[PDB]
Structure 1
Amino acid sequence: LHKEPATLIKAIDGDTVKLMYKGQPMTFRLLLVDTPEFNEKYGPEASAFTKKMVENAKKREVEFDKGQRTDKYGRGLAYIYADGKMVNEALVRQGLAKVAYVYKGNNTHEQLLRKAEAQAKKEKLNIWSE
């Protein structure tokens, strides 16, 4: 896998962001995670985390996995990095997303995120507090 420049249009919520990819405004969905919907518990916190992480970054990058690059909804499927730190991983590590939607075609960072989730669970953070 290889990283490439991400041109940010706007943050959307915990696990989606709007990028301009090859000159097309495009929703990107974070691979291997699930943040709460904005209206659900930890939803506003997940949204705020992803938003500030991507916005405050000097270097924003997108990394496709080996399989499907878009889902059935036309959304890009990628890992997103902010100054070298993976947003997908940071959400899981902080208890603001569950590892989810694990498809064998696009699962390169599964073990990494499962490691992060086990630590969030141990620490009883956010989603794992109840």
Structure 2
Amino acid sequence: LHKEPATLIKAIDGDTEKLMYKGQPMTFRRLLVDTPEFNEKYGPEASAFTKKMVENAKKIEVEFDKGQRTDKYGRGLAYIYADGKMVNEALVRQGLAKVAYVYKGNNTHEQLLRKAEAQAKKEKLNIWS
């Protein structure tokens, strides 16, 4: 897999951001994760976490997997990195997302995320508390 440049246009929520990719605005949906919706428990905290992470980053990168690059809603499907740290992984490690939506051919980082989830669960973090 390869990291490619993008620039933040707007944080949206725990699962998505508006990013400029190849000079075109796009909603990106994070691969392999599910954050609570804003009206659910830890939903606001997941959105706040991603917002800070991406807004504070000097460099945003997107990493597509081997399979579908866009979903049925026209959202890009990627691993998102903020100054080299994967936001997808960071969310799961803090118990602000579950590993979810694991489809064959778009699951390169599945085991990394599951390890992170196991640690959040062991620590009884946020969703796991």
State TM-score, norm by structure 1.
0.97
Contact kept in structure 1, 2:6 and 2:22, CA below 8 Å: no
Taking the aligned partners of 1:23 and 1:82, their CA distance within structure 2 comes to 18
Q: Report SS of the residue matched to 1:79.
A: strand
Q: Report SS of the residue matched to 1:104.
A: coil
Query: What is the deviation of 1:101?
Result: 0.2
Q: Report SS of the residue matched to 1:118.
A: helix
- Per-residue CA deviations over 1:29-72 (Å, capped at 9, x if unaligned) read 00000000111100110000001001101111100001000001
Taking the aligned partners of 1:119 and 1:113, their CA distance within structure 2 comes to 10
CA RMSD, Structure 1 to Structure 2 (Å): 0.7
Query: What is the deviation of 1:24?
Result: 2.4
The percent identity for this pair of structures is 98
- Per-residue CA deviations over 1:9-46 (Å, capped at 9, x if unaligned) read 00000010001223322110000000001111001100
Taking the aligned partners of 2:67 and 2:23, their CA distance within structure 1 comes to 22
Unaligned runs of 5+ in 1: none
Aligned residues: 129
Q: Report SS of the residue matched to 1:74.
A: coil
State TM-score, norm by structure 2.
0.98
Unaligned runs of 5+ in 2: none
Query: What is the deviation of 1:98?
Result: 0.1
Q: Which residue of 1 aligns with 2:86?
A: 86
Q: Report SS of the residue matched to 2:9.
A: strand
Divergent runs of 4+, >4 A: none
- Per-residue CA deviations over 1:92-117 (Å, capped at 9, x if unaligned) read 00000000000011000000000000
